[PDB]
Paper text:
Connexins form hexameric channels in the plasma membrane known as hemichannels, which can either function as regulated passageways between the cell and its environment, or dock with a hemichannel from another cell to form a dodecameric intercellular channel, or gap junction channel (GJC). The connexin subunit, which is common to all, consists of four transmembrane helices (TMs) with a cytoplasmic N-terminal helix that in the hexameric arrangement of the hemichannel points towards the central pore. We have shown, however, that connexin26 (Cx26) and other similar β-connexins (Cx30, Cx32) can be regulated by the direct action of physiological concentrations of carbon dioxide independently of pH.
We show that mutating K125 to glutamate, mimicking the negative charge of carbamylation, causes Cx26 GJCs to be constitutively closed. For both proteins cryo-EM data were collected from protein solubilised in DDM and vitrified in CO2/HCO3- buffers corresponding to a PCO2 of 90 mmHg with the pH maintained at pH 7.4 as was done previously. For the K125E data set the most populated class (43% of the particles) had a conformation similar to the LMNG-NConst. The KVRIEG motif and the N-terminus are reasonably well defined in the density as seen for the LMNG-NConst structure though again, the first three residues are difficult to position. Overall, the conformation is very similar to LMNG-NConst with an RMSD of 0.35 Å for 195 out of 199 matched Cα pairs. Thus, it appears that the K125E mutant is sufficient by itself to bias the conformation in the absence of CO2. The effect on the structure of Cx26 in changing K125 to a glutamate both in CO2/HCO3- and in HEPES buffer is consistent with the hypothesis that the CO2-mediated closure of the gap junctions is caused by the carbamylation of K125.
Residue numbers in the entry:
A (entry chain E), B (entry chain D), C (entry chain C), D (entry chain B), E (entry chain F), F (entry chain A): 3 to 105, 124 to 219
The structure:
Amino acid sequence: WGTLQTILGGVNKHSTSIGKIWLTVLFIFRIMILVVAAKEVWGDEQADFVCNTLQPGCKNVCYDHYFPISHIRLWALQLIFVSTPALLVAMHVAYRRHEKKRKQEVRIEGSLWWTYTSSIFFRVIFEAAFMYVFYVMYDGFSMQRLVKCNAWPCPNTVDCFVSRPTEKTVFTVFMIAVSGICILLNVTELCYLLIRYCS
Amino acid sequence: WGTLQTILGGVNKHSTSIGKIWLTVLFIFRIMILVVAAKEVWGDEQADFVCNTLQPGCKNVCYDHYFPISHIRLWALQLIFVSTPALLVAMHVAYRRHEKKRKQEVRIEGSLWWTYTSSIFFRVIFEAAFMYVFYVMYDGFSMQRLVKCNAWPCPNTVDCFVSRPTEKTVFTVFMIAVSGICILLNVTELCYLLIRYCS
Amino acid sequence: WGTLQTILGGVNKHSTSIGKIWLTVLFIFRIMILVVAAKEVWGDEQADFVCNTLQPGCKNVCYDHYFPISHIRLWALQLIFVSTPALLVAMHVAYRRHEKKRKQEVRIEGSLWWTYTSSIFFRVIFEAAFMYVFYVMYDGFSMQRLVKCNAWPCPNTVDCFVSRPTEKTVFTVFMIAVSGICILLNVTELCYLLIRYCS
Amino acid sequence: WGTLQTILGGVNKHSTSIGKIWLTVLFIFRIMILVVAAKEVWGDEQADFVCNTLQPGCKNVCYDHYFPISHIRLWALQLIFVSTPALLVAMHVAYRRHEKKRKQEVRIEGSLWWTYTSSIFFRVIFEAAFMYVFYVMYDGFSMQRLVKCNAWPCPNTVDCFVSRPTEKTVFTVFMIAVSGICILLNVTELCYLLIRYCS
Amino acid sequence: WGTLQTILGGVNKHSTSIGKIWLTVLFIFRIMILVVAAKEVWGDEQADFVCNTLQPGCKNVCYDHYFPISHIRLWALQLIFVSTPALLVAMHVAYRRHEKKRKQEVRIEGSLWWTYTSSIFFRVIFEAAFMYVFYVMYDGFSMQRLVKCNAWPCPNTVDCFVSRPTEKTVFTVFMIAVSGICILLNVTELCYLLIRYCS
Amino acid sequence: WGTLQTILGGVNKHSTSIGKIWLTVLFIFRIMILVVAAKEVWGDEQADFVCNTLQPGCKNVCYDHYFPISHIRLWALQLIFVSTPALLVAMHVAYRRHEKKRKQEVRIEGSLWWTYTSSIFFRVIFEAAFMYVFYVMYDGFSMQRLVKCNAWPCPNTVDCFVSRPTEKTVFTVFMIAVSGICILLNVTELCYLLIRYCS
């Protein structure tokens, strides 16, 4: 997109001290990694899914059973979910600034408190929910070479082999670690606000 | 597209309070999901359609019978249909504003009533029509692993297996849920108007 | 293209009342439909063309016999043909406007009559010619599941199966219906002009 | 390219009356056809080249023998060759205009005669040379379904079948016809100048 | 990206004498090499990985064992890691310049010392770490034609063959050599600084 | 890239009379040919490399032995190497012009001599080196249909067949011929400078 500098620049202006660090980690180490590197790693996820069997349709159902939603698609949904609360508030800052000018460090004074605090709180919950889904659905952050499958129409148990499990594990750990960093950064911004008003 | 900021910004100016929320849901949670994630899920719909048979041409007719229109193609048509009534009115709002200046909250004063009210009414009807088609043509919002097919030239009944049914079910539920939200948002705007004039 | 807003905006300024409606139908429901939906429906037209035979080269000659020119390529040529008469006149209006300023509703006063009237007349003829070719070459607007082929080197008659025929029929009906609407809109603009000058 | 409007607009300003017609035929009916439609017609030229043989390497040498240069690659080279003489002169017109301003219909007065006349003359020769190569190398403008090949290592004569010969023939006739139109338009511009100076 | 000139130009302004040389080596000989040429050298890395065996899943586990992370993915991560410390400081230089103007050779005077010195120091460490990982994981900078694999489920030892090993070795040597040049350039900037303050 | 007009225009301003011709040949007849036509001539180089053998891995090692570096990747490296000395000097010319304005034909007066005379000299050496590598590694500028291969693990000698050798020979001759023209143009600029200073 050609307007990336426009939106990133706009969000950068309407942010606190820590909040500008957050935009760096979100765009550089989450969007760029997902686009430049991660998406190509998952490009052949079903094509080189290999199952030791002669049963028609067994490969289709075994891949579906073990990867109900792809990792990269899960990360794409997470990025969209944690981007809207930031962009909506940043848009609201412009409207508030627009009213004053019609009469550069962002300060929370009035009703902006209940929007900024909610946006920070929502982003913490959204990241935690996706982190929990990643752990529960994939029983950890390590991809296995071999999966054992017994869903119909596979006879008894069938051995199946995943494409590039180690490279996928490496990028999974990277995305989870960065996401945890974003959670820590967001909690500090709550601590900064929670000691200004209620302390 | 590089002019997305131009059109989205332009439509944003010529909108009511709720109408700006509706534009966020349409572009973030419908267009971005369709482009970033959904389209790749359906990329191999016919390629890994697998049928347990030796009959030439049976795979072609069984896939055609069960997927007369792809889900992503249905969503692409729906997005275009529900975007025109909003864009046409927004253009008409600019012309009406253009006339006044030649002599920033949009207010429905005169003939704009019969355009805005019709534009909202059309969007509700278009969204409901596509939701109805999605339900009827696909007997619900869950994709099945196995489809049983007996169209010519398949001998008797043939078992066929769908690619990534669970991933496709997840994105189908997401898209229908968001469209239902858009319908609810549109109905409220009618309620806001229907109590100003006729109440 | 990034300059789409520029050319569409320029054509929009130099147009009549109905002519602006024609612009939306051409770009929204014909170009966007062809680009974002229709083109990948036809992406695998020859790849999943399946013929029940063991004869080398029979699949090649049977596909060529029944699809001498692809539907989407036929629509690409038609869109280009019906776009030039509109753009050629539009730049001529700019030159005429350029002359007057060197000394915003378009009015047909002088020599613009024989350009605008001809451009409308040419677009009706171009659209009718392509609508006629579509009917004659494909014996109607419905694509069949099975085609029977007896061209050399196929032995006797060979059964062959088309990829996604129902999907292709749906988009064929959509494109023909919209193009027929454009003809009706074009004829009215002739009626508006005809009753002004010769009535 | 996003700067297409810039270069086309720049070339449009520095041109004669006929020369502006030549710009539309070159870009709309040659570049757009080549990009939008023609290129994907040839996308599978070697992939679905089929030969009735069991000899390894026979398909490779038979395709190479009969298509030493691809049609679309031949058209891409021709378009580049006939675009430079126009762009170089148009750039030279800007420099001449730059000198006068530092002291909108283009007229040839002095040294511009020997540049404009040469540019027109070169484009006629370049187009004729490519049209002659198309005829001589491909023994006409009709692609055949069957080619008979006896180059080593093919045993005796081998039958081979071309992908989409009819669609390729249709676009070949279209490109040659438009190229001949451009030649006719260029000769007229020579006639216009040849009666101004030497008559 | 269309804003590349914007960011590169901005980084170019806020740099020292040597730091502007480092910008060209990073963008021209590392980013362009990776994008234009290297990436599609690795495009078929697993597709033409060939193993002499009949064992299902042996190709999957042998490729994973010998290429836990792809070379081009390793270079993409390295480029991102060594770009942020330069971009963050260049952003900080703008803020420092912004404060002075609100009251073109960059000079380190105050707190900029501890940011610039750390930014240079981090880049040396990041580059050395990736150069060390490249050597240790791939036992050198030369890719072998044959790899011997005995991981489960391969029986005994299996011979496997890499796609384009000489081609990949050439680009590996090129990328490592340029990174060593960048390390040498960065060390000199430390020497320039370490003799101004502490000498 | 959208900034191509910006960089090409900027380089065009800061150049001599001949240097502007060399800009045309480099971009139109080398970059455009490489991108538009040549690159996808080589798109299938290894996929349709065919070897008459049953030995696993023989195709991999025979292709690697005869094409250690692809032609298009060799050309991509050469284009980057001969572009940097021109761009670096042109940037230096801007800085020199910046100094004078802060106090349109480029003239070589002072320190610009040792930069310009070296950029020209480097470009001649870089082009000659790549022309030498092309000749030595590929034993000439003609690609052969058949290559005979005996590297391990191929048994005795194996016959292998190249994809589109004639098409590749035609583009190889074109690229070498243009490169030789650029060398001749560069040598003249040395002659122009040589007779000014040392004659």
